[PDB]
Amino acid sequence: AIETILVINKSGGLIYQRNFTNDEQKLNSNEYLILASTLHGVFAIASQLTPKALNTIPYIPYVGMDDFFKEPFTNWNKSGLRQLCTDQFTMFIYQTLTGLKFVAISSSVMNLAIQIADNFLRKVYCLYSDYVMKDPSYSMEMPIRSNLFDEKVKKMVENLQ
Amino acid sequence: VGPKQAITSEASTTYYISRIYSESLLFKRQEASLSAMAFLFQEMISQLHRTCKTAGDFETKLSDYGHNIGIRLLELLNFRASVSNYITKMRRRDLKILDILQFIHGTLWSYLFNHVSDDLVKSSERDNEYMIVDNFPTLTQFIPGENVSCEYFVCGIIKGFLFNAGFPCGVTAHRMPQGGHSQRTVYLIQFDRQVLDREGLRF
Amino acid sequence: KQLFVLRLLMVALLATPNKIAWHPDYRTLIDTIIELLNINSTWLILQKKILQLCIKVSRKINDFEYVAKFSSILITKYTHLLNQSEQDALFKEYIQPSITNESITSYWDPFILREVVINRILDSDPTSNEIPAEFTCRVQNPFKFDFTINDIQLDEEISEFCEIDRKAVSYSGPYNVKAESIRSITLPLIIKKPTYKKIYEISCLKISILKLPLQKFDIINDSRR
Amino acid sequence: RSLKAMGEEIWKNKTEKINTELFTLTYGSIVAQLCQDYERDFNKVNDHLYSMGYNIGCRLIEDFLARTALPRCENLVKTSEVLSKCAFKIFLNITPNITNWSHNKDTFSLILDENPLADFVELPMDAMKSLWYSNILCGVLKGSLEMVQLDCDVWFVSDILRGDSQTEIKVKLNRILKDEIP
Amino acid sequence: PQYFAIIGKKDNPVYEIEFTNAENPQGFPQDLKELNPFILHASLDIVEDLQWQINPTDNCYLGKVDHFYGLAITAYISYSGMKFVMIHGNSANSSVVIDDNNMRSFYQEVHELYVKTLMNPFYKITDPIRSPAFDSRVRTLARKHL
């Protein structure tokens, strides 16, 4: 259901883009960076609406057949954008405590629907922090040029659908 | 017993048990995580790409660490495998090349990485060259190994397992995907002619 | 074992009270004693003993360039392990016959002068440079002290005088230096002269120790220009 | 408790474990080559191995928070001592102990009972005075807690192999704002 | 009157020491300099062409090996590179006594003192050992087996 994944660094810039299974393109690189800068600008102001004028945990369904940690975990994203839905796609956001934002955009629709696309996105943040965090070519906050990263998340797109 | 001084000392007619620091040396088990040692190796390779010029000098300036601790792991790995210390015996030393590259194959990898490298192939065309392939190398599995300069920790660590053994040896690594096992690395080692000719006296 | 039995051959030649003038195989015998080692092995006290035996053969058979050669190589390549005992006080008497011969040159140590200062002495009130780390020397007397490291005495410094620069050259030095210490020096006494004023640097100067005049002994661990 | 028990639980997961002898030998070889190369400048190897520690202090905490999905550490002392007491044992299987506070528990110490970085090192007689053997931990803890925005100031004050009987690290916590948008 | 040596790969003595029985109260006066490296240098020669063959199952220990015209020598070869040599014997008698098993429980017993000093990562190869403690340990480890 998911067809493109981005990751964002904490200083408001794109890190990685892969248009996985859409296979007709019109977007080159810096327009995706325009999306990355604008979602960082949106996620700036998207807490202080405070419309209330005043414990929530995610869960465990075992996405991606083992998994890494079989427990209903916490999440740091208590105030801000989580997901969007339009008539042609839907999009997802997961932040870390450190500051990396973890985009996933899905063309079809896939409560529980945020929670499955949260449970996917803890796995790739584990997979980010084992396969390009431990890499001496990777200087900090740069793009990802590990091909070893890229098929190991390309395998997990077909381990989703 | 200094280099400047002689071998001079005193008589045996006393008993000086004033000792400080000597302990056990046995096979302890503490088993740290691969992320921690991977980060140690990670910032080490970061320092070596910082301080060094080009390919080959960086390859030597990686393999020198293996030459530092290869002697050290050789002698008590042999002192544990072929032998406090209420010692029965110490068994046979290196007879030839084919027991000592069995000794990397037998109990060096299973000392380090809890398994065995899958082959110890004697080469076809020559005999000075030998080749060991690890199938899925443990300490460099995260590095995208298109440059094969990052696995010269272990070429340095086996060269210092054979330089004490009296076989000076050109040790290289290549990587070749011969199977569905991907990113398996071949350590095609060589020797010199002379201990090959010391083998070539009689075999 | 061949070096062991040839060492016994050489101690047989020391203990023999018969008399010998030199036979042209002792060339090759002492050459092969030296080249069963690799010396031009890191067992240094063996080198001390086997060079002491070679020096005693070359005394008893009187090949004076070889007692020159091998005792100069003994003094240069060793003697951190030679204090005033183990016959270094009863040595250097063994090489004043080298230096009263024409045998050795150059004074083997290239570390003699520890530093250089040309510090002044004020005489008059306002006879100074009143309008102009360089020196621009004022008519006075210098002092440049040195060290020895070889703990023998009698290294008589003579004719300490400067290099190929101007008439600023030292006068005389008729006294010796000490056995061990970094000895202060007495009166170099430059006889400086007003010339043209462009900058002319020294590094060191020639020294002779009862011997031939050397070149500039470059100062330690630095230029110290 | 919860955290104390899930430390021994989350020791058992996917990425395999290897024996500490290799890790100790690698660290000893790095510090021996750096002690040889800088001509016994033991002050300079302290800050070089400190920056060596801090440059994986920047990158340890992402693997820590990924492999251990853990919430925000709101208490700045008691949660900190119990998380570091489990959080060495997730990486290098050791359980340090914590005493020697301030009045407000600010400059607290962390006594390590037994060190796997030097099981068997007898550091030499010239290197008594201006060296600590294991300041890479002072690198990696200051990095690993600066990336959760806690401006620590670690330093060694005593170890085993400088002569003393306890291995501990004192730490002054300054304060720093602008975490994220939560 | 006993003389220990550990002699390295490029002929360097990494540890060499004498001691004496007080029943002798001195050691080999005027013979202490020919029974040094030259005899031991030839002992390096005979263990050089005695180690690499199988046959003149205990490949390390070798026992008594040779004999100059005043005494006789013993040996040991480790796979660390090092070749341990003890030189024993009262100078009056030709000392025959090779215990051969209890001083086999010295060479594998002094081996770990070399091991733990080799495991000092500041300690290099091809440099001698001024341990103030490991040399005081071995004479008391030779107080076990005189």
What is the rounded distance in angstroms from the CA atom of residue D74 to the CA atom of residue B169?
Answer: 58
Q: Which has the closest alpha carbon to B31: D18, C118, C60?
A: D18
* Nearest Cα residue to B24 out of D93, E143, E112, D138: E112
User: Quick one: three-class SS letters along chain C?
Assistant: CHHHHHHHHHHHHHHCCCCCCCCCCHHHHHHHHHCCCCCCCCCHHHHHHHHHHHHHHHHHHCCHHHHHHHHHHHHHHCCCCCCCCCCCCCCCCCCHHHHCCCCCCCCCCCCCECCCECCCCCCCCCCCCCCCCCCCCCCCCCECCECCCCCCCCCCEEEEECCCCCCCCCCCCCCCCCCCCCCCCCCCCCCCCCCCCCCCCCCCCEEEECCCCCCCCCCCCCCCC
**What is the domain partition of chain A in residue ranges?**
1-49+75-161
Given phi > 0 = left and psi -120 to 50 = alpha, else beta, which region is C95? alpha
Q: Are D and A neighbours with ≥3 CB pairs closer than 8 A?
A: yes
Given A43, A69, A78, which is nearest D13 (Cβ)? A69
What is the rounded distance in angstroms from the CA atom of residue D68 to the CA atom of residue D88? Answer: 12
Amino acid at site B72: R
Report the gap between the CA of A23 and the closest CA in chain D (Å).
31
Alpha helices by DSSP H, listed for B109-188, are 109-112, 152-162
Rounded to whole angstroms, the Cα distance separating D86 from D78 reads 12
Q: Among all residues of chain B, which has the CA nearest to that of C81?
A: B4
Distance CA C169, CA C144 (A): 13
SS3 D58: helix
B43 contacts on D by Cβ (under 8 Å): 52, 55-56
Helix runs in chain B, H state only? 34-51, 55-81, 100-107, 109-112, 152-162, 193-199
Question: DSSP label at B119?
Answer: B
Question: Would you tell me how many other CB atoms lie within 10 Å of the CB of residue C27?
Answer: 12
Chains with 3 or more CB pairs closer than 8 angstroms to E?
A: B, C, D
Please report residues of C whose CB lies closer than 8 A to that of E39: 4
Which phi and psi angles does C67 have, rounded to 5°? -70, -30
Chain E nearest CA to D128, separation (Å): 13
Distance separating alpha carbons of residues C93 and C114, to the nearest angstrom: 27
3-state SS assignment for residue D61:
helix
DSSP reduced 3-state for B116: coil
The tokens describing C83, both together, are 């204090």
Instruction: Please list, in sequence order, all residues whose beta carbon lies within 8 angstroms of the beta carbon of residue D64, skipping any fewer than 6 positions away.
Output: D70, D87, D90, D91, D144
Q: Which two tokens mark B178?
A: 């011969």
**Check whether domain A1-49+75-161 has CATH 3.50.30.60, yes or no:** no
Radius of gyration of chain B (CA): 20
**Amino acid symbol at B96:** K
Cα separation, C122 vs E39, in Å, equals 68
Provide the sign of the torsion angle of the four alpha carbons B175, B176, B179, B183, taken in this order: positive
| Contact list, D14 vs chain A (CB under 8 Å) | 66, 68
Residue found under tokens 């003393």? D164
| C touches A, CB cut-off 8 Å, minimum 3 pairs | no
Experimental method: cryo-EM
Cross-strand pairs, B171: B189
Q: State which CATH number among 3.40.430.10, 3.30.365.10, 3.40.50.620, 3.30.1380.20 fits the domain covering D1-182.
A: 3.30.1380.20
Give CA–CA dist A36/A38, Å, rounded. Answer: 5
CB contact under 8 A, A135 and B144: yes
Closest CA to A95 of A109, A108, A84, A83: A83
E69 at the D interface (CB within 8 A)? no
- For tokens 């733990």, name the residue: E116
Residues A134, B45: C-beta atoms closer than 8 Å: no
* Structural tokens at position C163: 């290099």
CB within 8 Å: D119 and B65: no
Task: From chain D, pick out residues whose CB is under 8 angstroms from the CB of E119.
Answer: 120-121
Resolution of the deposited coordinates, in angstroms? 4.2
Selected residue of E11, E17, E49, E85 to mutate for chain C interface (largest C Cβ count, 10 A): E11
How many whole angstroms from its chain centre is CA D175?
20
Contact B66, B154 (CB under 8 A): yes
CB-based contact, A76 to chain D, within 8 Å: yes
Of D72, D96, D69, D93, the C-alpha closest to D84 is D96
